[PDB]
Amino acid sequence: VRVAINGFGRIGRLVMRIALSRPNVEVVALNDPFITNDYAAYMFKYDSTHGRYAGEVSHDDKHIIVDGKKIATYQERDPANLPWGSSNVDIAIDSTGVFKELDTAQKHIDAGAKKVVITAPSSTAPMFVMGVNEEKYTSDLKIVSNASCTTNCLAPLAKVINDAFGIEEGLMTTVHSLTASHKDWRGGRTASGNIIPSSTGAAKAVGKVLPELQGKLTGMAFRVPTVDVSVVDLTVKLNKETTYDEIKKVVKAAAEGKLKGVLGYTEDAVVSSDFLGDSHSSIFDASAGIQLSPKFVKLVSWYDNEYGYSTRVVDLVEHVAKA
Numbered sequence: 001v002r003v004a005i006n007g008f009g010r011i012g013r014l015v016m017r018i019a020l021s022r023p024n025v026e027v028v029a030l031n032d033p034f035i036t037n038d039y040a041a042y043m044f045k046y047d048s049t050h051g052r053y054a055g056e057v058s059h060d061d062k063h064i065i066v067d068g069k070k071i072a073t074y075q076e077r078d079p080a081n082l083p084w085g086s087s088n089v090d091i092a093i094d095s096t097g098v099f100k101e102l103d104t105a106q107k108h109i110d111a112g113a114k115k116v117v118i119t120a121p122s123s124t125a126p127m128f129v130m131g132v133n134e135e136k137y138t139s140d141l142k143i144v145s146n147a148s149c150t151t152n153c154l155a156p157l158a159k160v161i162n163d164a165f166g167i168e169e170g171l172m173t174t175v176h177s178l179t180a181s182h183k184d185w186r187g188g189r190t191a192s193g194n195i196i197p198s199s200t201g202a203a204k205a206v207g208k209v210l211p212e213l214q215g216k217l218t219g220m221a222f223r224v225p226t227v228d229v230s231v232v233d234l235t236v237k238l239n240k241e242t243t244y245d246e247i248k249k250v251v252k253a254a255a256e257g258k259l260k261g262v263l264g265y266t267e268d269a270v271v272s273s274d275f276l277g278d279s280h281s282s283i284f285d286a287s288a289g290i291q292l293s294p295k296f297v298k299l300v301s302w303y304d305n306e307y308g309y310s311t312r313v314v315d316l317v318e319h320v321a322k323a
């Protein structure tokens with residue numbers, strides 16, 4: 001599968017790290033009009049939380065070069081101008097966050113890509129979360145969205161819980177790290193010393209990938225100045241009586257079976273930085289959860305804000321291509 005990345009921000013760069021390691025994905029090109037090749041190579045090589053790239057990174061006038069692989073670079077403000085057809089690009093991965101609707105991401109198909117994966121929620125493109133609704137994807141869909149990182153954490157867990165005990169209602173909190181203000185006053189305050197309440201649309205987004213949960217979840221976030229690992233805190237009313245031991249067994253079974261690699265499970269005394277670089281969408285913290293009564297429980301799940309999501313992007317890219 002031949003892929004091109006639009007945008008060299010954190011997501012674009014981690015998607016490239018992951019895709020370079022994928023045996024059946026080949027990174028052909030990168031587009032970003034706001035950076036130079038030497039700055040691209042520098043940003044790809046060094047990462048404050050995911051470490052130096054384990055490999056040789058360099059550049060020339062027309063490429064970024066990684067372990068001898070030459071990746072062509074472009075600086076087109078308008079993606080319709082990109083030589084995707086000329087380069088035989090199968091999937092265009094758009095991580096800019098600005099071509100995230102059907103009419104805008106269409107520019108990549110116009111440029112000659114066969115399909116587009118948007119690494120951000122979309123109001124018009126169908127959203128897919130691996131482990132949740134990827135079997136609903138049909139090969140005639142040419143433009144798809146991978147939803148958000150918080151949605152990717154919450155949705156696989158909410159599906160497991162709802163399938164086994166039934167979710168009647170749920171309220172969610174996410175303790176959310178900085179990495180990713182007339183419109184949002186709290187968020188314009190200094191990150192450094194502050195807990196900063198925020199709204200988040202993840203609990204509603206779950207209603208779009210799990211329609212049976214539509215209208216059953218809402219929540220908010222507390223932003224804090226920590227490494228880019230976040231944690232969801234899901235307080236749910238259940239349909240069926242259960243015990244926490246049974247919740248643990250069901251989640252662990254899903255993590256070891258059908259949701260392997262997407263949903264993780266731990267009983268260790270972890271803290272947020274223990275999940276830097278974790279490729280799971282969601283890591284259930286069995287020891288942090290707490291049940292009060294047979295149908296009332298608090299579930300805790302971790303996620304690396306960028307890395308699990310980027311791994312899912314490449315997962316979706318491969319899935320959409322095999323179709």
Ligand SMILES: *[C@H](CC(=O)Nc1ccc(Cl)cc1)C(=O)OCC
Pocket residue numbers: 011119120147148149150176178179180198199200221223305306309
């Ligand atoms: C996941 C990264 C992320 O958490 N972004 C973010 C969400 C909410 C707030 Cl308040 C700030 C930052 C992700 O989906 O990134 C792609 C946009």
